[PDB]
């Protein structure tokens, strides 16, 4: 029994539907193949900083990302690289809401207000040693799904 593969299935379902343009999907595939090895070597917090820096957390994309947590009709817009980093960010946050590491209400109230994403990063920094051990198999499954389903250039 490996339920992180089912969690990866449902998260990959959501993000594979939320990426309209195929270039966005291929970009997410490259993100998935890179960031798991990056979080292995470098740790969770540096990789998370890198991810949120390349994700362009404007309230627009933040709102599409919040709506992904409920809708399955939400869409991620932006450049292919931007949306791929946002999709990987949603992957991580989805794993965190599931597995109860972070309350969903706190996550949503942080993604809404800009004065609270800092508290979100603080909580994630406090929990990073746990997250680093937990999410490895989930992210490896995400990577396998990406390179299985999304074609490459």
């Amino acid at each position: 029994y490996e339920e992180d593969y089912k969690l990866a299935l449902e998260a990959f379902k959501k993000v594979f539907n939320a990426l309209t343009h195929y270039g966005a999907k291929q970009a997410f595939r490259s993100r998935a193949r890179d960031l798991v090895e990056e979080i292995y070597n470098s740790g969770f917090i540096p990789t998370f900083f890198y991810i949120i820096s390349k994700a362009e957390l404007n309230s627009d994309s933040l709102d599409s990302l919040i709506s992904l947590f409920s809708s399955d009709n939400a869409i991620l817009r932006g450049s292919d690289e931007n949306v791929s980093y946002s999709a990987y960010l949603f992957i991580i946050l989805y794993y965190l809401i599931k597995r109860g590491i972070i309350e969903q209400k706190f996550l949503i109230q942080a993604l809404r207000c800009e004065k609270t994403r800092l508290d979100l990063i603080d909580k994630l920094y406090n929990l990073a040693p746990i997250i680093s051990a937990k999410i490895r198999t989930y992210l490896l499954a995400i990577k396998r799904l990406s390179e299985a389903l999304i074609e490459a250039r």
């Binding site: 070597n41 470098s42 990789t47």
Partner: protein
């Protein structure tokens, strides 16, 4: 002994060198130079071996088997490689210097630490224990320098003070050894403590920014901006080429290595950034 031959060499950067480690997340530059466990620039023995092996396979087309016997088979290896490369340790790196009170002026100077010298000494001791080779001239010069460990020294100069890489003020002191065969050009050689020499050496590399031009608007493409670390020209690395006993190892060490002088290392070759001279301590010291 375990090795039939043990031929150390120096790696002199003719042009600038880029041997990359490939875009970590904790780095700041996005194409840094290969570092080692202590933080100094290095050339992994795998990079060394691949570059030298490809060069030799193209430059000695009549001796592939010999090369294949010593450096390994590319396809279907029925046996291991007879030859071994050690990671190239940074011997001396050019560093920018400002110094008053010296008749001979210098724009840059060689910098080393006692750590790197101790690693070179370790390599030499290990290869003397595993082979019939003794490089006692090198060992004597190196341990003469190592006897001063714990304070910044200058070998071939009258430098008392200096600012290195415009950040680090050092007070030096002379030493009457002056290894001139590895530093031929009369360029001084500083040997610094390890706590001060790490920062000096690490800020002694060249970070060049490159861009990509959007060839329609003729401006920089979005996201097309990155930096690359290079190792300055005239940087010296130290490595050894170990060989196990074989009739081919003899031909390799007497015919191939005697005509192997220049190679291309690392990447960015079309930017003219890979050319290297190999010295062969055997016939330099």
């Amino acid at each position: 002994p375990y090795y039939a031959f043990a031929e150390p060499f120096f790696i002199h950067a003719i042009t600038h060198l880029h041997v990359g480690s490939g875009s970590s997340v904790e780095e700041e530059i996005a194409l840094p130079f290969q570092r080692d466990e202590l933080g100094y620039p290095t050339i992994y023995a795998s990079s060394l071996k691949g570059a030298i092996k490809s060069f030799l396979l193209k430059e000695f087309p009549d001796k592939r088997d010999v090369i294949y016997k010593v450096l390994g088979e590319d396809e279907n290896p029925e046996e291991a490689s007879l030859g071994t490369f050690l990671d190239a340790i940074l011997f001396a790196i050019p560093s920018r210097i400002i110094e008053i009170d010296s008749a001979k002026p210098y724009v840059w100077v060689y910098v080393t630490t006692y750590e790197l010298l101790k690693k070179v000494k370790l390599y030499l001791d290990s290869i003397s224990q595993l082979s019939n080779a003794s490089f006692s001239n090198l060992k004597n010069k190196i341990d003469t320098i190592l006897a001063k460990e714990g304070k910044n020294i200058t070998l071939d100069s009258d430098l008392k003070s200096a600012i290195l890489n415009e950040d680090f003020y050092v007070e030096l002191e002379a030493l009457n050894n002056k290894i001139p065969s590895i530093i031929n050009a009369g360029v001084p050689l500083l040997v610094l403590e390890d706590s001060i020499g790490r920062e000096v050496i690490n800020r002694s590399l060249i970070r060049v920014r490159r861009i990509r031009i959007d060839r329609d608007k003729k401006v920089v493409e979005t996201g097309g901006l990155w930096s690359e670390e290079y190792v300055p020209m005239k940087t010296i690395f130290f490595s050894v080429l170990l060989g196990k006993e074989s009739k081919e190892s003899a031909i390799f060490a007497s015919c191939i290595l005697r005509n192997l002088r220049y190679v291309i290392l690392g990447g960015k070759e079309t930017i003219g950034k890979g050319i290297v001279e190999l010295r062969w301590v055997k016939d330099v010291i």
